[PDB]
Design an enzyme around this catalytic site. Structure first.
Site, PDB file in Angstrom:
ATOM      1  CB  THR A   1      42.942  68.834  47.751  1.00 42.84           C
ATOM      2  OG1 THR A   1      41.846  67.479  47.742  1.00 42.84           O
ATOM      3  CG2 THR A   1      43.024  69.103  46.229  1.00 42.84           C
TER       4      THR A   1
ATOM      5  CB  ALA B   1      36.683  63.709  42.793  1.00 42.39           C
TER       6      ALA B   1
END
Lengths: 228, 240, 238, 204, 250, 215, 213, 239, 201
Positions: free
Chosen positions: I1, I49
């Protein structure tokens, strides 16, 4: 002689809701017409003074990007319901990724059209015309203070609704077009209003599957009026 | 005027007119009587057919509160159901806390206090019901109580609730209680209900009989009324 | 009429008139008819409209896979008891993982509508429920009232001028128990063709029929799957 | 500990006809000092003071709460407050936070409002009163001030020997202490007047 | 349960509020106060409603309530409602001092009490407070002040005040003897003595039936002088000698 | 319950032709102490179903109380409708799940056996809410010990008779008396058929010890 | 102490086709080193065009299935039409986040048809994220199954291998092969394989056994 | 608490207390306000003061922000409550969104509060009518009024208080675009309108302006005296 | 990420990778991290998320309500403020959320940075994620204000390439969005291995 406000009648109805149906009648008129091309809608502002700045009076307000509305009579009781109806449509698109259809909107409104009481106050005083284009094509919807919600193909409300419904049933049929219905509405308007019809009196709101959002700025109204 | 309005106000002579009007509300209902024998209690309710209006089995006023207690209501019906639900709930609390079957005195006293508590105030109306409560126990015998709309709850051998109230107890008092088993009392109550309340204003009627005692081994249920059919074979012989 | 103001006040004749007034509010609905065979329960209502251009106010609404209700009177109280009805159905459908029998549901309806009929400052629910269902022991046709005195019947009819419907149902209640779906449904709408004046009847525009079957889920029909049901009739007499 | 977060020492000493209360001036965060003018002795009416020691948060909080209730009491009743009444008030205010306790050890020293009778007492962090006749102390350096006052006290004291005794006691007991120093303020009060002197303490 | 309900909130169909005016006409009886701010100080005046010979006067106070160090208030109306108000007001000013550790300025005190009164005028049907009351006080921003509470919640600063119905003529007298800032504390006292001498119909103003309290400005004290009776006596004698001097013009 | 005080032990249940037999023993153990040698660990629910459990006995008394009250309420409805055993299984699963979601579990391990409408039923309910249907259930150490006998005979022949089922239960209880330290030679057999629910008496086992003569 | 969770295991697969959505799952429900049963299908038929599978902790799977069915019935009784697939996905994400601070220990896979008639698989996580992917394998044998579907369905990491659209019976032999190959090395793969196929004409099911180990 | 509905509909379709609480507005002090294009002006008439007392507490014109200005009619206490709540709301808006508060937002807040106040259980409706004048971003002068019903309603000049029909009739025959050309003339136009209203001795003429890039300035009543003097001079020049 | 955003003369650039692992195991390769809030706002995915998706979706709800009440689309700072206010009410309960908010304003470009720790700051360059420092390095090499369009595209794309080359958790596909004055516009979706072929030679 003051009775309880949640008393039915000797004949059967209620009292306060019936008095609300009476309280609609003093309000300004409005005319909406369902057409398969899209839903058109019209209203009268009832301008009183020249000191009264004309573009600030709201009659057509916006519920969704595709669900329109118009109000009558009392303004501010209508404003609460418009705000809340918007909130509940936003809850539906959020928790469902899809558009709350207009019937489901009006079910959500007339769930508490009558929750008037002393615990858990008065009934609301507004008649509403609901339009928009859902998956079932165009829809035109009409509720009342009593929550008795029904679909109407071309309903006219308020103070001039008698001759409006009559002369509307004269001109209406199933296979109308858009612009024909627009001028067919404003002919009825300038037969039922009191002042001279001009650029500042009325306002339109049309939503189409093609013309995707209800969009109606000024001075196309001028082009429509000079077409009379 | 003014003094018949609230259920809180008194009268210039000292009574509550709400409670009186509620007492004579139950006066228009059908006649429902009850009587106990030396080993059981027999109920019986006159139900009336108008022409069609239902099916042989709706809205049966013989309720069944606990395993050994049931109601024999008469009066306003929905209020009687709410009171029966409260009585089932109270027997539930007693069974859940003390672990044994509710004595009929305590059940009647709790229900009487609830009915009396609904008479105290102006927010609520008094009940429009008057009902019967029968039971049986091996250590207690047979007990038959009776609760008015006011909340006065005490015990009887026989009682009657409805339109015909004295004329239904004219011949309750001609029976006796020591010498009878309840299987005679079934057809006795049956023949008298067919005797009282003549055919004059209503045309067809229909009989229900509830039944508790030692013969049910402590259970409370409706008779197999179709079995032995004991009313009618003597009831048609009761017209002369 | 100083006793005719509130729900709390008993009359000096014992008839609390708020309930009578709610009864009269039920009497001002549309006509509707519900009737059962041994294997199929059918309820048929009549629609009306406010004007010519508007659509007709629908009456038969869905509740559950085997329970459907008719209605008469007000619509806000109708949808309120409707929402309570779906909620109480799906509660036991969640917990016990079985369908509800109808009789305990209608007992819950009576216990629900008791409280606004006894305390002060609440109205009796103006409502005209005709409930058709399936427990394990077959069809049930119940009706309610604002007094919560729910009935089980074999054929009832409530609404405006619904008494002639009851007269038609009396002279065919012997014939009702044996027949299959088709002539049963057309007996129901023959009750409806005598609840009307003799020159406007049911030209695919005002009637709705809800059948529940032993293999058939509760289903509403309106004018177009009713056009098969509307033929197979004769005219009214002279 | 939490009591040794900001240091602090309050001494009160009863004389013959008068009473003397003194405290330190230092404020800081465990090893880092900040200022030399932090107030720990508050006036509660005339000829009656209170001293607060411990965590400075509870010092200012309890001082303002007590001033709140004190002015409400002196306005509900036109008279001024007796010292036992103030002691009980502080005890109730501290005991309302029985399980949420403030970190403070209040010391009350004042004269009688009717007579010239002196009065001293001290409380604990939950509200335990204690009236004595000689002295009460509160703070980190307890044992130092105990040694000083049990070494130097006489029962019948003119205010001059009272002042010099409490002066020597505070100076020596603070100089043995680490986290509490940086000046001494001394209030020596009597029936006629109120005297406030500051001593030449080690600024280390 | 609604036919017993008294409806003390709904407007009247004459056009005004109904119970509000009758609370005002309940103000009008049993009471007569004023004060004279015209520099270096401010005063209050009061009439004994219970001037009977069998009291005690042991309270060291009367109508005046020293509500803080630097503010008092004169009462007129029903007394014990005002005790409810003085307790709540004193507690309000004291919580403000708790919150800021600076004394409370007089207008947010007045508006807090006015919001309390309007809170019982606006909603419910509760009985309104039948108490109008005065305000003297000091601040950091304007000096000496005077305020007039009303049962509606309306207030208004004055320089020469009035509550009781006997004192409307006093307001006429305060205008006819208006000064532009001249309170040497003997001129204002003689004027107040003259006003209460004329307006009350008590002949010659016995000093047991009156009450005068002043508030002067001292650097560290802000003393409130609820003065004793002997100076009132010699003030009455001063004023009656000045009335004899004033009627030598006839 | 955070700490189970007085535990039972393993419960055995198996279907057969038109019925379900369940047998559990009658011992109430505290720690290692066989403190309560005469208790009942099977409730005979009304006429079509039947319950047996393990774990904390007090929680079993509690659920005995609650289920008895619910059954009494439906029998007092008078509608002719009863609870199916699967409905009871669902209700009990929801009860255990709502217990464990609030971090206050009912320490049990319950087996529901019922016969209604031609079909046998044998349900399982864990403390954690793990719940399923099975032709043969076994709790505690029974899932380690008498489970392979059930799955052995049921794989070679999927249906059974009542005599074969009862004999198999007797053998499994013999094995559990052999190798459970918390076990006891007194058990009761409970049986559902179409004839009703029947609880047999406190039977015992016949053991073998001829390995002890081997040194 | 009392541990509130336990790992029951299970393996759920999904494949999104051009006009079909195949969801398959083993039927072993186990705990630790024991077998509770050999028949417990993880698949559930929601609508005529939506099948959901749920593995992980079993009680939360049952509870979640029943809540989803209830809200489906609520949507039907409010809006006269069944939900779509993405509507169910959004609602399930709101539910799975609505117990954030006492989480579900549940992997979720929704297969079904969209409103255009195409395949759509919406994966999930225990806390409430989702995404529209073509194929997912959830549960204990996830890592034994994802790279092989990347090799056959996704055509990844290969050279001069053209892209053929995935047919039906080819997907069927894929599902059978991956469950045999995963059942060789896994301890949680059942015997009964329950294959659910969602077409434009209804729901088909199919039961294929395995080795009985 | 107080479980009752004070305001019931009429048998002929009214709210008694909303239409009737306008009478309390009708029997209050008069106040006008116009907008010029660059300078805004408003002010109240009929202070009806005792001419010999303080006047800093009876101020009927206040502000909520440095951008927005007040006026009202009716009874003053309800105005005090509504102004306190409006100050809280505008500052809480500044807490969130970092703009200066738009006037349309605060008028919608006041009208929304007023309507949910009339709707609720037993709360007496507010018998006031406010004027909310402000000039938000890009300098646009706008002015709205309120009503006991709760209808924010944009105007170009004011007509409230006692005899508002006469004042609006003067503004009707005085709608000249020329009047809003010279800021001084707009001030003089307010003075002439209020002069065609009550005594207008130059004592109860309390007026305050804002030139939309500053704050409100309360004018000292000698400048207003010269304004009235030059108005009388132009009135003499009319003959 | 690894995500980044930087504003310049011609609006705002936002790019991100698409790998979202679970411990040492990669769940997916095509996780669309730049969450599309509006036709004028772009939010990101930074760690959590479910949390980022949920709270940004709720912010979109609040913004749409705001637009329907004010007839004027919300600014960027107002949206960031509402997001920070909604996130702060769960401090310490274990929310991981480090998103960014981008959009066009009446003032013009807007770039804010909202944490689950509740940090809210403006700025010109940002980079969030595990391998964000790698993006910071090459970005603060190539950053200026007076840049072209294709220069900024190559800068952002190369930056995410370097980040995914060094970091182990970053990877997958390089998304690329461009915020303009009128509305945002997706530029391209480029794979890593294609960029490896492009920049290896």
């Amino acid at each position: 002689y003051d009775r309880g406000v949640n008393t039915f009648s000797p004949e059967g109805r209620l009292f306060q809701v019936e008095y609300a149906i009476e309280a609609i009648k003093l309000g300004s008129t409005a005319i909406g017409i369902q057409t398969s091309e899209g839903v058109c809608l019209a209203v009268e502002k009832r301008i009183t003074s020249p000191l009264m700045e004309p573009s600030s009076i709201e009659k057509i307000v916006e519920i969704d990007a595709h669900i329109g509305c118009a109000m009558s009579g009392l303004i501010a009781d209508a404003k609460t319901l418009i705000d809340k109806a918007r909130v509940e449509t936003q809850n539906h698109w959020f928790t469902y990724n899809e558009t709350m259809t207009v019937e489901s909107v009006t079910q959500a409104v007339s769930n508490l059209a009558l929750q008037f009481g002393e615990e858990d106050s008065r009934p609301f005083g507004v008649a509403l015309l609901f339009g928009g284009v859902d998956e079932k094509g165009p829809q035109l919807f009409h509720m009342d203070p009593s929550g008795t919600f029904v679909q109407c193909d071309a309903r006219a409300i308020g103070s001039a609704s008698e001759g409006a419904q009559s002369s509307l049933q004269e001109v209406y049929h199933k296979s109308m077009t858009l612009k024909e219905a627009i001028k067919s509405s404003l002919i009825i308007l300038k037969q039922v209003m009191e002042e001279k019809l001009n650029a500042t009196n009325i306002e339109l709101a049309t939503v189409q599957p093609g013309q995707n959002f209800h969009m109606f700025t000024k001075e196309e109204l001028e082009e429509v009026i000079k077409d009379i | 005027t003014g003094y018949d309005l609230s259920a809180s106000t008194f009268s210039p002579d000292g009574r509550v007119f709400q409670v009186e009007y509620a007492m004579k509300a139950v006066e228009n209902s059908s006649t429902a009587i009850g009587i106990r024998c030396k080993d059981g209690v027999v109920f019986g309710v006159e139900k009336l057919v108008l022409s069609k209006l239902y099916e042989e089995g709706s809205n049966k006023r013989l309720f069944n509160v606990d395993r050994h207690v049931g109601m024999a209501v008469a009066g306003l019906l929905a209020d009687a159901r709410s009171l029966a639900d409260i009585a089932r709930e109270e027997a539930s609390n007693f069974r859940s806390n003390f672990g044994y079957n509710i004595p009929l005195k305590h059940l009647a006293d709790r229900v009487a206090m609830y009915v009396h508590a609904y008479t105290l105030y102006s927010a609520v109306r008094p009940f429009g019901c008057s009902f019967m409560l029968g039971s049986y126990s091996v250590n207690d015998g047979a007990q038959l109580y009776m609760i008015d709309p006011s909340g006065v709850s005490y015990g009887y051998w026989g009682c009657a609730i409805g339109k015909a109230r004295q004329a239904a107890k004219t011949e309750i008092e001609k029976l006796q209680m020591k010498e009878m088993t309840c299987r005679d009392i079934v057809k006795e109550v049956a023949k008298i209900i067919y005797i009282v309340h003549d055919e004059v204003k209503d045309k067809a009627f229909e009989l229900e009989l509830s039944w508790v005692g030692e013969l049910t081994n402590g259970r409370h249920e409706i008779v197999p009324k179709d079995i032995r059919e004991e009313a009618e074979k003597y009831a048609k012989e009761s017209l002369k | 009429n100083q006793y005719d103001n509130d729900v709390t006040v008993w009359s000096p004749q014992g008839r609390i008139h708020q309930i009578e007034y709610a009864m009269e509010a039920v009497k001002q609905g549309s006509a509707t008819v519900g009737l059962k065979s041994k294997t199929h329960a059918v309820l048929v209502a009549l629609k009306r409209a406010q004007s010519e251009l508007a659509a007709h106010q629908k009456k038969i609404l869905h509740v559950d896979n085997h329970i459907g209700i008719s209605i008469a009177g007000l619509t806000a109280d109708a949808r309120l008891l409707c929402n309570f009805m779906r909620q109480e159905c799906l509660d036991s459908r969640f917990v016990f993982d079985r369908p509800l029998p109808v009789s305990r549901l209608v007992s819950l309806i009576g216990s629900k509508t008791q409280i606004p009929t006894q305390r002060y400052g609440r109205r009796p629910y103006g409502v005209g429920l005709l409930i058709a269902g399936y427990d394990d022991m077959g069809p049930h046709i119940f009706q309610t009232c604002p007094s919560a005195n729910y009935f089980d019947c074999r054929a009832m009819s409530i609404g405006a001028r619904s008494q002639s419907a009851r007269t038609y149902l009396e002279r065919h209640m012997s014939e009702f128990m044996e027949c299959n779906l088709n002539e049963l449904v057309k007996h129901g709408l023959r009750a409806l063709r005598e609840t009307l004046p003799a020159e406007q009847d049911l030209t695919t525009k005002n009637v709705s029929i809800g059948i529940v079957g032993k293999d058939l889920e509760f289903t509403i029909y309106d004018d177009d799957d009713v056009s098969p049901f509307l033929e197979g009739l004769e005219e009214r007499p002279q | 500990s939490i009591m040794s977060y900001n240091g602090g020492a309050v001494m009160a000493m009863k004389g013959k006809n008068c009473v003397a209360i003194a405290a330190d001036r230092r404020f800081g965060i465990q090893a880092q000092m900040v200022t030399t003018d932090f107030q720990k002795i508050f006036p509660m009416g005339d000829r009656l003071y209170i001293g607060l020691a411990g965590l400075a948060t509870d010092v200012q909080t309890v001082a303002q709460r007590l001033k709140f209730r004190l002015n409400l009491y002196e306005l509900k009743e036109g008279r001024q407050i007796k010292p036992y009444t103030l002691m009980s008030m502080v005890a109730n205010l501290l005991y309302e936070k029985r399980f949420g306790p403030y970190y403070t050890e209040p010391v009350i020293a004042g004269l009688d409002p009717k007579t010239f009778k002196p009065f001293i007492c001290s409380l604990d962090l939950i509200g335990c009163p204690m009236v004595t006749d000689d002295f009460v102390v509160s703070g980190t350096c307890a044992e130092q001030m105990y040694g000083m006052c049990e070494s130097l006290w006489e029962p019948n004291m003119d205010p001059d020997h009272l002042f010099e005794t409490i002066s020597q006691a505070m100076l020596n007991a603070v100089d043995r202490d680490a986290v509490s120093g940086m000046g001494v303020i001394v209030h020596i009060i009597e029936k006629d007047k109120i005297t406030t002197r500051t001593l030449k303490a080690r600024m280390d | 349960s609604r036919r017993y309900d008294s409806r003390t909130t709904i407007f009247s169909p004459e056009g005004r509020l109904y119970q509000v005016e009758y609370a005002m006409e309940a103000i009008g009886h049993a009471g007569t106060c004023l004060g004279i701010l015209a520099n270096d100080g401010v005063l209050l005046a009061a009439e004994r409603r219970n001037i009977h010979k069998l009291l005690d006067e042991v309270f060291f106070s009367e109508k005046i309530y020293k509500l803080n160090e630097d503010m008092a208030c004169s009462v007129a109306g029903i007394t014990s409602d005002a005790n409810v108000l003085t307790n709540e007001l004193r507690l309000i000013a004291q919580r403000y001092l708790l919150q800021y550790q600076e004394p409370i300025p007089c207008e947010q005190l007045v508006t807090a009490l006015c919001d309390i009164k309007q809170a019982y005028t606006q909603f419910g049907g509760k009985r309104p407070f039948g108490v109008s009351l005065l305000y003297i006080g000091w601040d950091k921003h304007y000096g000496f002040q005077l305020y007039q509470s009303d049962p509606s919640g309306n207030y208004g600063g004055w320089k020469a005040t009035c509550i009781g119905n006997n004192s409307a003529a006093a307001v006429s007298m305060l205008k006819q003897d208006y000064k532009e800032g001249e309170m040497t504390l003997k001129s204002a006292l003689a004027l107040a003595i003259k006003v209460l001498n004329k307006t009350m119909d008590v002949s010659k103003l016995s000093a047991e039936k009156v009450e005068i309290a002043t508030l002067t400005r001292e650097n560290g004290k802000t003393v409130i002088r609820v003065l004793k009776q002997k100076e009132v006596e010699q003030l009455i004698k001063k004023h009656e000698e000045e009335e004899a001097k004033a009627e030598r013009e006839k | 319950t955070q700490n189970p005080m007085v535990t039972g032990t393993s419960v055995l249940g198996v279907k057969f032709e038109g019925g379900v037999v369940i047998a559990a023993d009658m011992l109430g153990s505290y720690g290692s102490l066989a403190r309560f040698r005469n208790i009942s660990r099977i409730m005979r629910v009304n006429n079509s179903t039947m319950l047996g459990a393990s774990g904390d006995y007090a929680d079993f008394q509690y659920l005995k109380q609650v289920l008895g009250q619910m059954v009494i309420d439906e029998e007092l409805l008078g509608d002719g409708h009863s609870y199916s055993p699967r409905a009871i299984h669902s209700w009990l699963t929801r009860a255990m799940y709502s217990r464990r979601s609030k971090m206050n579990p009912l320490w049990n391990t319950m087996v529901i056996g019922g016969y209604a409408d031609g079909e046998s039923f044998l349900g399982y309910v864990d403390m954690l809410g793990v719940a399923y249907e099975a032709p043969s259930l076994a709790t505690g150490y029974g899932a380690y010990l008498a489970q392979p006998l059930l799955r052995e005979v049921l794989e070679k022949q999927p249906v059974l008779s009542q005599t074969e089922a009862r004999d198999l239960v007797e053998r499994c209880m013999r094995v559990l008396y052999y190798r459970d330290a918390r076990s006891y030679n007194r058990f009761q057999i409970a049986t559902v058929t179409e004839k009703g629910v029947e609880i047999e008496g406190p039977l015992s086992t016949e053991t073998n010890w001829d390995i002890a003569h081997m040194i | 102490r009392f541990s509130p969770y336990v790992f029951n295991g299970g393996t759920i697969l999904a494949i999104a086709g051009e006009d079909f959505a195949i969801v398959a799952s083993d039927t072993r429900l186990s705990e630790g080193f024991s077998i509770h049963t050999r028949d417990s299908p993880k698949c559930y038929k929601l609508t005529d065009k939506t099948v959901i599978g749920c593995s992980g902790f079993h009680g939360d799977c049952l509870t979640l299935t029943k809540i989803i069915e209830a809200r489906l019935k609520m949507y039907k009784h409010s809006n006269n039409k069944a939900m779509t697939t993405g509507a169910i996905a959004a609602m399930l994400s709101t539910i799975l986040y609505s117990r954030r601070f006492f989480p579900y220990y549940v992997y979720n896979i929704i297969g079904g048809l969209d409103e255009e008639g195409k395949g759509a698989v919406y994966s999930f996580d225990p806390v409430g994220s989702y995404q529209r992917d073509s194929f997912k394998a959830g549960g204990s044998a996830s890592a034994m199954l994802q790279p092989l579907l990347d090799n056959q369905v996704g055509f990844k990491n290969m050279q001069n291998v053209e892209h053929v659209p995935l047919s039906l019976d080819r997907a069927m032999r894929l599902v059978k092969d991956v469950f045999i190959s995963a059942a060789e090395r896994d301890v949680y793969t059942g015997d009964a394989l329950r294959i659910c196929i969602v077409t434009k004409e209804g729901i088909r099911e199919e039961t294929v056994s395995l080795r009985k180990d | 608490s107080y479980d009752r509905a004070i305001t019931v509909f009429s048998p002929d379709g009214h709210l008694f207390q909303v239409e009737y609480a306008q009478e309390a507005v009708k029997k209050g002090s008069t106040a006008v306000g116009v907008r010029g294009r660059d300078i805004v002006v408003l002010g109240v008439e009929k202070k009806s003061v005792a001419k010999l007392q303080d006047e800093r507490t009876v101020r009927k014109i206040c502000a909520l922000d440095d951008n927005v200005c007040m006026a009202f009619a009716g009874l003053t206490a309800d105005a005090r409550i509504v102004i306190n709540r409006a100050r809280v709301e505008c500052q809480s808006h500044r807490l969130t969104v970092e703009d200066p508060v738009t006037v349309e937002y605060i008028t919608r807040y006041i009208a929304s509060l007023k309507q949910r106040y009339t709707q609720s259980n037993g709360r007496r409706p507010f018998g006031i009518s406010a004027l909310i004048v402000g000039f938000d971003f890009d300098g646009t002068p706008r002015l709205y009024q309120t009503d006991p019903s709760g209808t924010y309603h944009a105007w170009k000049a004011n007509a409230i208080g006692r005899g508002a029909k006469s004042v609006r009739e003067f503004l009707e025959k005085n709608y000249t675009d020329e009047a809003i050309e010279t800021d001084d003339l707009t001030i003089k136009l307010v003075i002439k309108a209020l002069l065609e209203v009550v005594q207008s001795g130059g004592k109860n003429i309390e007026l305050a302006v804002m030139r939309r890039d500053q704050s409100l300035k309360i004018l000292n009543p000698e400048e207003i005296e010269k304004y009235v003097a030059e108005i009388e001079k132009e009135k003499e020049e009319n003959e | 990420t690894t995500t980044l955003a930087f504003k310049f003369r011609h609006g705002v650039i936002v790019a991100a990778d698409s790998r979202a692992t679970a411990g040492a195991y990669i769940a997916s390769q095509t996780v669309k991290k730049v969450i599309e809030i509006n036709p004028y706002l772009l939010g990101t995915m930074a760690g959590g998320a479910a949390d980022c998706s949920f709270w940004e979706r709720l912010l979109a709800r609040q913004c749409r309500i705001y637009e329907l009440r004010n007839k004027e689309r919300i600014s960027v700072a107002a949206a960031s403020k509402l997001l920070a206010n909604m996130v702060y009410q769960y401090k310490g309960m274990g929310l991981s959320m480090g998103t960014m908010i981008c959009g066009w304003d009446k003032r013009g470009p807007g770039l804010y940075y909202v944490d689950s720790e509740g940090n809210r700051i403006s700025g010109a360059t940002f980079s969030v994620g595990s391998g964000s420092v790698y993006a910071y390095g090459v970005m603060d090499r190539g950053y200026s204000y007076d840049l072209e369009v294709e220069q900024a595209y190559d800068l952002a794309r190369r930056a995410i390439y370097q980040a995914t080359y060094r970091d182990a958790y970053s990877g997958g596909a390089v998304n690329l969005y461009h915020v303009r004055e009128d509305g945002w516009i997706r530029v391209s979706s480029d794979n890593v291995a294609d960029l490896h072929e492009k920049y290896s030679g």
